[PDB]
Ligand SMILES: Nc1nc2c(ncn2[C@@H]2O[C@H](COP(=O)(O)OP(=O)(O)OP(O)(O)=S)[C@@H](O)[C@H]2O)c(=O)[nH]1
């Protein structure tokens with residue numbers, strides 16, 4: 001590989017962080033929900049401008065009740081996929097709290113991509129696309145809606161963030 005980019009997954013529990021990771025790295029998806037244990041790592045390489053970019057994606061549980069995420073989790077990360085569930089407005093409301101967590105524990109120039117996941121539940125949508133997109137605008141973040149289930153935009157989300165990082 002030519003470059004190794006550490007990118008982390010963050011967002012409320014249940015939003016789809018883990019399946020987003022499995023879909024991108026192993027083209028797999030599981031409907032059985034299992035809260036993530038400790039910190040998980042997955043890798044994948046892609047081509048960007050003729051070069052080979054090794055993407056190292058970090059994943060962890062969204063709940064920080066008894067054990068909160070440290071700067072070590074974020075350390076050296078050049079990218080962050082901040083995820084929420086379009087069907088659960090609460091997970092969208094909490095994005096502000098995650099941005100504060102990034103501000104306090106991650107490099108000030110990290111590339112942050114807001115990800116509205118569970119696109120396939122468009123009929124149960126609680127967070128209008130235009131509103132989220134505008135929000136991403138005002139906060140200087142990239143934005144994209146995905147579906148780890150039907151696979152919509154998953155590759156595009158990761159591909160885009162890595163390219164932005166390049
Ligand atoms: N309909 C739909 N369900 C999805 C999608 N992505 C994940 N899910 C479902 O949501 C549930 C939680 O997904 P998961 O990937 O475990 O969440 P998480 O953010 O990693 O959760 P945690 O480790 O912080 S607790 C699962 O039952 C999974 O199958 C998606 O695009 N569409």
Ligand SMILES: [Mg+2]
Nearest residue numbers: 017018035036
């Ligand atoms: Mg998980």
